[PDB]
Ligand binder design. Structure first.
Ligand code: HEM
Ligand code: HEM
Ligand SMILES: [Cl-]
Ligand SMILES: [Cl-]
Lengths: 181, 181
């Protein structure tokens, strides 16, 4: 199954440490996030919100970037990676109507997304889910996990991404910080 | 709603003229195709199959290409566009694991998909839907409609595309030919 669901409420494998409502309407604070590998139609009881998305193909990265990533990126579920952060993102209509060279140019040529992210590996593990195509309120679910040593660096990465040209198209962002139970 | 459904069976706005099972397991012949702008979970009565897909953002076209397309491409549902073809396509795992530069290059640099397709406009109208990300048996549903004067041309276009480098990655294909009721 390529589909993943995230349920904020009273049960799950993860404890909510905090939520930061960076841009746009926020998400309700909950005790726990429950993560599931499947679609969930039936909104669980005592649950405040459901996010979902799917794992998909590469949209921007070129072969050499892929090779560079594969050489250093960590797997998910390292025993040390007890902190995680879920970050939903929505981009503007003006971004989606742009052609594929335009978007590519803003993503790497101008914003150096891949080159910047590479500096935070192997400390940081990541997964990217897509959800615009499902009718969701957000366009993406981003997932990051790392050992506590790396929390500082991760915060530094967030402030850099948000200073890029790419982030000018971002109209909605929440940080859900988590601790593995 | 970005989601479109196509049910083969005994009702619909389109009459099946023929089905050609070009490559891989085919689709059951039926009398009609019903086309709905939403999901359909409830497998309709006396229906052989259901295909679905969503409209999405541009994946390969650059700005200059988009501009050429917009100069000439016809709208859907022109009075004279009484013939239609629905063509589901699946591409190989080996296609999907390639990077974004690699697929772009096979699609345009080697195959000239857009340049070739542009020679058949404005006779031919088209819609493109994606469905690998939904877990369908096909990766894409393609939709073409035109007046009968353009049938022979459309047939020439199919044979050109299928000789392309792109089409070496196609592992499943069906043409469903239709007539508007
Ligand atoms: C930690 C190191 C990071 C690396 C190595 C990295 C790498 C990448 C790469 C290579 C892609 C492109 C995937 C593709 O071609 O389909 C991507 C996409 C994305 N990344 Fe990152 N990333 C990192 C961190 C982050 C962070 C912190 C955020 C947001 C807070 C983020 C948000 C995104 C988004 C939203 C996309 C999808 C872009 C789109 O389709 O418009 N990434 N990331
Ligand atoms: C009639 C003129 C045609 C034009 C102008 C045309 C144009 C295009 C364009 C510009 C794209 C890229 C969309 C994007 O960047 O997201 C595309 C994708 C596609 N076209 Fe065509 N097309 C034509 C005919 C056909 C035909 C006859 C077929 C199949 C029999 C076909 C199959 C496809 C498929 C499968 C894709 C998606 C490729 C992918 O995302 O991997 N096209 N078409
Ligand atoms: Cl990823
Ligand atoms: Cl289209």
């Amino acid at each position: 199954n390529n589909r993943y669901s995230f349920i904020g409420g009273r049960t799950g494998q993860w404890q909510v440490v905090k939520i930061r409502n960076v841009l746009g309407p926020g998400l309700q604070l909950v005790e726990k996030v429950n993560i599931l590998n499947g679609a969930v139609a039936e909104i669980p009881l005592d649950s405040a919100w459901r996010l979902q998305g799917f794992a998909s193909n590469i949209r921007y990265a070129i072969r050499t970037e892929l090779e560079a990533l594969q050489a250093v990126q960590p797997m998910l579920n390292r025993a040390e990676a007890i902190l995680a952060v879920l970050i939903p993102i929505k981009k503007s209509a003006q971004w989606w109507e742009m052609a594929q060279d335009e978007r590519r140019d803003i993503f790497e040529r101008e914003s150096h997304h891949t080159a910047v992210g590479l500096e935070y590996l192997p400390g940081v593990a990541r997964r990217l889910l897509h959800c615009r195509d499902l009718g969701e309120e957000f366009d993406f679910l981003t997932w990051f996990e790392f050992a506590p040593e790396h929390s500082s660096a991760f915060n530094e990465l967030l402030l850099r991404m948000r200073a890029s040209k790419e982030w000018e198209y971002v109209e909605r962002e929440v940080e859900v910080w988590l601790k593995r139970l």
